[PDB]
Design a protein around this ligand. Structure first.
Ligand SMILES: C[N+](C)(C)CCOP(=O)(O)O
Ligand SMILES: C[N+](C)(C)CCOP(=O)(O)O
Ligand SMILES: C[N+](C)(C)CCOP(=O)(O)O
Ligand SMILES: C[N+](C)(C)CCOP(=O)(O)O
Ligand SMILES: C[N+](C)(C)CCOP(=O)(O)O
Ligand SMILES: C[N+](C)(C)CCOP(=O)(O)O
Lengths: 293, 293, 293, 293, 293, 293
């Protein structure tokens, strides 16, 4: 908070009384199904120390959630997006540097609750024959309650070096038709990994027995559209005013197969089965304030 | 957040010191009952890289929730809107591109709660005859609680390519007269799919035994009015400054029929029975900054 | 959100650097008790495509909650407002069109909660005579909880065509003196529809045995005052610059009667008994920017 | 609150009608994996008393969560980041002083709840043979409930002297696969410290039996990126207008080892095993308003 | 609220169209470990009645939480900060006066909940031999629940006279390792004051058996940094335009000692054992608008 | 809400394009310990109808919570602030009038919850000897829950006439060491009024057995600082332009005494024992726009 140090709010920010030349570059990768897009903005504040360039890799990455193989009614497979990644890199010989990046790791909290209860009890029982009975009792109880919120997909900022910074979205866990949350490492001795399972002991075809993509999370089938911001700073006295960047939009898929053993369906998951990578190289012209490729 | 990178807020946005020529086109499709409307805005910022055009397909799509067929008092049908869709497309030979789209897939969270309880107990019982008894006991308890929020209709952004982007609203589930949430795949061995069922064993006519549209969700009967935004960017050095777009407003209906078997009503649902499509082609004039059709 | 597409906020809105000529027309319908009022605003933005006119039918519609008929102490009636409606229409031969309307159908959500509990138990019992007993036990529990919020009156936007758009407010359900929520279709074999019932087996007069209007909802007795906005767009090259509109303020009442059968009061409801309609025709002068009637 | 003393809001803040010369210095420490960065801003308000300089050590510190040693399948180790630290210091002979620092210790609250319950009971039991029995009972209950929120990592502001100020982020506690929160001092007679333990009695290799970094907190593996602000004030009549600062980015790691004793895994933690320090010295030029190194 | 009296918001505030000369004075007390700082602002509004000066004693006071004495393994002591205080005073012969002070005593609320439950019960029991039994029962329950939030440290504004105003932060209560909240007056016949106790019957050294400062509150070890505002008003026609102020930063520590009696540790607390005071005198020059010392 | 009548927000407020001459008067009453202060503001808007003057009696009133009398170890007294009051009055012959006053009585709400539960039960019991038993049962439950929030002190606006307006803060109730809320009229046959009681049957001195002022509410010991606003309007054509006001800061104390009867302490409260009043008269000069005394 700028106002908590008694400084007038917005005083220390950069971008005042200057013209920024924005831009946009859109490209679609038919082979990998990644509608990648970057939104740049050249800021050169005289009161600042270095030339600035903020790059927002908005884009969109498809989900690719479908049944790839079926072998009769006995067994079938499924490929689902385990993780989405997008990273920017600079050549080792380059002079520009990575300064900031908005989406960053944040500390997560949890509730906690301790309970203690004392009790007392006493009743008098009687019947027709005149018998009279008594009872005196007491009890204690101690309880611990802990609650927290866990998303389906968890965004992470991989350790950013000076030249490359990258983000990552992984599959935390999912709830299958109101059943408890399942994850890639979940296992059951009878049924196995019941993550994308429709019915435990249905009589349908193996390929038919899979969770409806509408029922599952949206990111599995319709994909994940990132919104990540990074700023590159270049010294204004550098000999060479041209820079190259690489943008990658890799996606990792897993193999989920269920098998009809004797009576019930048994599901098995094989993590990190395929990876689809789409890298494109852009060129920066600091003198002309335009990035084109 | 722009202010989290120490950049002054609003610096990187586009639209400063320029005039935008907005517009409006309204058309009603009597056959399909779709009051479609698009709201465009031509933005040409000199500091930007490409000409811009944001299109907001506000419109409105009717619900069409009514009983289509009745066969005596034994059985009757019902057509209800399973899903609403609206998509924009560009010709394959076009030079413009789709850049951004506001409503996008978002990660959904869930609560979780673990409980543990220890107990102790002890009572002393006595009667008139001098008998004295005792009792010492203990207990343990482990509990898992998981809660989440689920809407009636779920909006989804279908994987947007470079030329076409489309949204989709599907029927997640509904609560029937305070009874548990039902969906298209819900089944009961006795009653069947009780989604749009008034009384389980009523003596009324089959056509009369259907849930009141007022009781059900508003989108089923009065329809769904979208609000979706997309921006098309065209290079300012292109030879041809005219572009064509197609806007579709398709709606998918399902067939819900209940049948009087012997004593109780039995309901059956047939998903994706009908689809109504309304496509209109617009023309863009970048040089004159007007879209007309 | 305009700022989520990287466009500067408020850029695409219409109404900048222009003068809007507002207005007001107030009329009271003594026969129907409807204090109707419309608030118009003529916006002609040069950068826009069509002339604009936003109409806000604020007004007010009375409730008319009273006992209409009494027949001795054995039976009596009651008329209460089941639904309030207000709709605007344009002639079929007109050239103007309906573009937008603020209050629109919205998707409604619901909570859901699944619980699972394991238990264990064990006690040792002894008495004076040296008898020693034991007990070991366990238990399981599964629970489903679903909660949602339901208003007394539910506003709905009837499917708007190109020429007419109308809203609707209906009676969802009401709580009678802390008793469970009742609605028009509620039925009890003994008492019947206990919606507006004071005492189940009171000895008072039939007309006296009705729920106090203060206890019931405010809209039943003091009426409902709408606030609905609609915008009409007219091409600026049209030959005729005069337009006519019709505004209707219809209200629907139901007949609730309770009858003393032998020991207890029995209540019956007859939906859609009366309708009061108040239609007024206004004239629009686009050239002079004034609506008068 | 400035407005609560009847002073106009923002009147007492500093930074009005002046130009601030910001800056940026980025450096990466390959040996320690610390992407350190500082963002300075020189404010010289004529109406103020001293020259100002606010330093924001944004940077980023990696996590370094990995298995360092394995000795067969019997035992293996693990190094995880116990605490992250970042501190600024001034030479003892310097004339500048540390004035303010935004992130500061805050008081933490807790809920509390007291419950009291009275009860009464009575039943009548009878059988075929005409025996009639009775029972009258009562009970009391007293309960205390206390709940609070505890984060995984806790940021602390070490006692700031005139010359040096430093912050600190420590490992409060973590939840292991829905099991109760564990910390460095947690101990179990059978299993030991089960903090980073996958399975209690798994048959896998010792190195394989460790909690997945994705399952654990993000700061453990992907590191912690600070955002801390400090302002240095220098008298404007000082003879020497040059100042030196030191910035340290130390990180402390702990040694977690699990051992297979006879049947189950036993985990042991050794706090404060390694510390990685990265100190860099900057030079301040108040006359030229630039910090360079 | 200014707008609730129909006055335009901000009209009655002071500070419009004037220049305020702020300032800063920083001093560190090595002996007492108090980094004291004051931030003044001279406001002389012509439309106001008196010259103004708002003083913000931001500063910082250390915690000083450490074991001062140990006597073998049998007993040891501990000094912890019981309360932090900061107060401003004016000479009795002075002409200036204290007008306002932002942090002030506020009324605290509490929840309350009353519950009432009626019950009924009935079961039929039978066995093989044809015996039939019955049971009819009922119960009542009354419950009172009261919940409130209590912080660890409680800030208080001591009764401000015309010449001196002072604040105070005291130790309300603390939770020790999830155990119930303890305070200075808490007592247990067996263990005593278990406030800063690690293990009830540990075998470690007495000095070692103390709560980790990280586990305890942050203010105990890293200290408390105040933020308090006060405004001094001086008549503009006074003969003498120079004023003196005194600022005190006293801190009170308590003595917590645990003793190994025979089997378990016993803890005793001695409140108000030491007080550290740091008073500095400043001089105000109203004519020159500067406070220096 | 100004914007809900379609009027532009802030249009109807008063204070536009005018200069307000504020002021401040501070006085301390050593005898009664009341640091009273008033903050006036003269507003004369030409577009308004009357001259305005808003008076804010900020001030501060001490608590005066102390033991006044002790008689050995058998009994002792206590004086605590039961209520704080502050009121303004005008002479009966004056021409000015009281117009508005911000803190005003507000309606308070409460939650309510009705619960209904149905149950069913059935178990089968068997033993070694072949005996088989059964049991079928059911139960019902009805519950009413009502919760609300109640502060320790309750501010009230006494009925304001044309010449005088006054506020009042009373002692609603307090929680004594986690025990149920007690008030002045609370009574117990054994212990009596246990409001400010330390221990029920402690062996300490009577004067020592009183609740610590830190444990009790802050307003009891450190006092209550009001913030109340009132505006006085005077006709601009009046013959006499001078007005007199009276400001009172009365405080009411109660006598709480506990007595050692035979085994336990018994507490008694005597409401409205003392009242301390501090009235000061101010003079208003409308022509010169200054209030001085
Ligand atoms: C896991 N489960 C499907 C057996 C029960 C579902 O309840 P929960 O475990 O999600 O609380
Ligand atoms: C599903 N049901 C109608 C039997 C019970 C309703 O309760 P719930 O299942 O919605 O919690
Ligand atoms: C419906 N009722 C009047 C029998 C009980 C009221 O409780 P609820 O049904 O509103 O929870
Ligand atoms: C600690 N535990 C793993 C035995 C139980 C988990 O429940 P909780 O202790 O987190 O409430
Ligand atoms: C006080 N205690 C440690 C015995 C129990 C903890 O529970 P609580 O008293 O904080 O609710
Ligand atoms: C009143 N009491 C001290 C006996 C019990 C405290 O619980 P509560 O009455 O505040 O809920």
């Amino acid at each position: 908070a700028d106002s908590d140090i008694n400084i007038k709010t917005g005083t220390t920010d950069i971008g005042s009384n200057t013209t920024v030349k924005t831009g946009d570059l859109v490209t679609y990768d038919k082979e990998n199904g990644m509608h990648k897009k970057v939104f740049y903005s050249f800021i050169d504040d005289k009161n600042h120390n270095k030339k600035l360039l903020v790059i927002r890799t908005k884009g969109t990455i498809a989900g690719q959630y479908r049944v790839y193989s079926e072998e009769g009614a006995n067994k079938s497979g499924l490929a689902w997006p385990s993780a989405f990644k997008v990273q920017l890199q600079l050549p080792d010989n380059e002079v520009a540097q990575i300064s900031d990046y908005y989406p960053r790791n944040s500390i997560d909290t949890k509730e906690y609750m301790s309970t203690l209860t004392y009790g007392f009890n006493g009743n008098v029982t009687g019947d027709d024959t005149g018998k009279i009975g008594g009872l005196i009792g007491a009890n204690v109880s101690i309880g611990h309650t802990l609650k927290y919120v866990q998303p389906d997909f968890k965004t992470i900022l991989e350790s950013p070096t000076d030249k490359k910074v990258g983000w990552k979205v992984i599959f935390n866990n999912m709830v299958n038709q109101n059943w408890g949350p399942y994850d890639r490492d979940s296992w059951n001795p009878v049924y196995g990994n019941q993550l994308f399972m429709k019915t435990r002991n249905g009589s349908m075809k193996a390929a038919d027995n899979f969770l409806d993509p509408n029922k599952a999370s949206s990111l599995l089938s319709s994909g994940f559209s990132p919104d990540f911001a990074t700023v590159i700073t270049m010294d204004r006295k550098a000999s060479k005013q041209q820079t190259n960047i690489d943008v990658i939009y890799e996606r990792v898929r897993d193999d989920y197969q269920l098998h009809w053993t004797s009576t019930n369906w048994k599901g098995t998951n094989t993590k990190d089965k395929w990876t689809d990578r789409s890298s494109e190289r852009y060129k920066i012209d600091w003198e002309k304030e335009e990035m084109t490729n």
